[PDB]
UniProtKB/Swiss-Prot annotation:
This is Endolysin. Substrate binds at L32, F104, S117, N132. Endolysin with lysozyme activity that degrades host peptidoglycans and participates with the holin and spanin proteins in the sequential events which lead to the programmed host cell lysis releasing the mature viral particles. Once the holin has permeabilized the host cell membrane, the endolysin can reach the periplasm and break down the peptidoglycan layer. Induction: Expressed late in the viral replication. Optimum pH is 7.3.
């Protein structure tokens, strides 16, 4: 297990434009296209991202290319964020994957607002952090995925992703 395999489990792989859990146009391995309700706007974003006129459909290689870029962007984002970087730096590599997963799903600004959770993580108060992380819109809206990510923060193991 690693961050790529983890997010592949959590996000799936779809080669045609679909709506994500929030109703937003997405493609590939959780590549958010736009929050606009316009499918045409989403198709434009896709074409811009891929560099060709798609039919709203991409190949697996293209999906994996966007995915690589998106994981890299999530990491880069954490490292540029004054609130997230110190917490991320304090973590072991397994818990760093859980951190990247959160940012991939909700964005840097959204995760940086988990102030109390972040403090508990930096303190290595894992059970307390896990309880706090679950008191969130995140957990309520995507409880199975959040439970997996939270278990990863709680334990520093890949146990929530084994059998998957
Ligand atoms: Na998804």
């Amino acid at each position: 297990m690693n961050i790529f395999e983890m997010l592949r489990i959590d996000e799936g792989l779809r080669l045609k434009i679909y709506k994500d859990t929030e109703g937003y146009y997405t493609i590939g391995i959780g590549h958010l296209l736009t929050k606009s309700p316009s499918l045409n706007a989403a198709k434009s974003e896709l074409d811009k991202a891929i560099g060709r006129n798609t039919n709203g459909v991409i190949t697996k290689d293209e999906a994996e290319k966007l995915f690589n870029q998106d994981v890299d962007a999530a990491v880069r984002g954490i490292l540029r964020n004054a609130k997230l970087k110190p917490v991320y730096d304090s973590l072991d590599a397994v818990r760093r994957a859980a951190a990247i997963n959160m940012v991939f799903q909700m964005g840097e600004t959204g995760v940086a607002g988990f102030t109390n959770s972040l403090r508990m993580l930096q303190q290595k108060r894992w059970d307390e952090a896990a309880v706090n992380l679950a008191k969130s819109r995140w957990y309520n809206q995507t409880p199975n995925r959040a439970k997996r990510v939270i278990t990863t923060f709680r334990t520093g193991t890949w146990d929530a992703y084994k059998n998957l």
